[PDB]
Design a protein around this ligand. Structure first.
Ligand SMILES: OCC[C@H](CO)Nc1ncnc2[nH]ccc12
Ligand SMILES: [Cl-]
Length: 167
C-alpha cells in the first residue's frame, strides 16, 4: 500500500492520472520523482522547468555541479540527484527529443532506468516539448517498466485520450 490517490490502473504496475507533477510530488513526497531532463540538466521549461522552479532553483544549482564533475548524460540515460522539497530523490531521465532529431528508439532505453526503483512518480517520457507522441510513450512505458509507476499527465484533454485509446 502507498499514498498515491486518484489514479486509474492501466496494468498490474502502471497507473495514470490527470495532475500537475509538481503538485503531486509536494503532496505525496515520493521516494522518487522522475524529471524529463536533457543531457545538460538545463531545466528551462516543460516538466523540468516546473520541477526546478518549485525547488527555488536548488535543483539547477545541484545539477550544474553534477555536470561540472561528470559531464553530460547520454540520451536514454539517467542520474539520481536530490529531490529537494519535492521527493527524497529525483531520477533525471533523458528521453529522445524529436525536435532535436534524436532517435525515438532510445525511448525504451530511457524507460529502462525506471526499473532500478521500486516505486516512482513520473511524467510521460519525450512527451510535451520533447515532441514525441504521448500515446506511443505510454505504450513503451507499459511494455518496458516492471516496477510501480504513477504517471502524472498535466493536460486534461491529453489524459482522456490516453485512457480512451489505451489497449
Ligand atoms: O507527462 C509528460 C507530458 C505532459 C503533457 O501534459 N506534461 C506534464 N505532465 C505532468 N506534469 C507536468 N508539469 C509540467 C509539464 C507537465
Ligand atoms: Cl511538457
Amino acid at each position: 500500500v502507498n499514498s498515491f490517490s486518484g489514479y486509474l490502473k492501466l496494468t498490474d504496475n502502471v497507473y495514470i492520472k490527470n495532475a500537475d507533477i509538481v503538485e503531486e510530488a509536494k503532496k505525496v513526497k515520493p521516494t522518487v520523482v522522475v524529471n524529463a531532463a536533457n543531457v545538460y540538466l538545463k531545466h528551462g521549461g516543460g516538466v523540468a522547468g516546473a520541477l526546478n522552479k518549485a525547488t527555488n532553483n536548488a535543483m539547477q544549482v545541484e545539477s550544474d555541479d553534477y555536470i561540472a564533475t561528470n559531464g553530460p548524460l547520454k540520451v536514454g540515460g539517467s542520474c539520481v540527484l536530490s529531490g529537494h522539497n519535492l521527493a527524497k530523490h529525483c531520477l533525471h531521465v533523458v528521453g529522445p527529443n524529436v525536435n532535436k532529431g534524436e532517435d525515438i528508439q532510445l525511448l525504451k532505453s530511457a524507460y529502462e532506468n525506471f526499473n532500478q526503483h521500486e516505486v516512482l512518480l513520473a511524467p510521460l517520457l519525450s512527451a510535451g516539448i520533447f515532441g514525441a507522441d504521448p500515446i506511443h510513450s505510454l505504450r513503451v512505458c507499459v511494455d518496458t517498466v516492471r516496477t510501480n509507476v504513477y504517471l502524472a499527465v498535466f493536460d486534461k484533454n491529453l489524459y482522456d485520450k490516453l485512457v480512451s485509446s489505451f489497449l
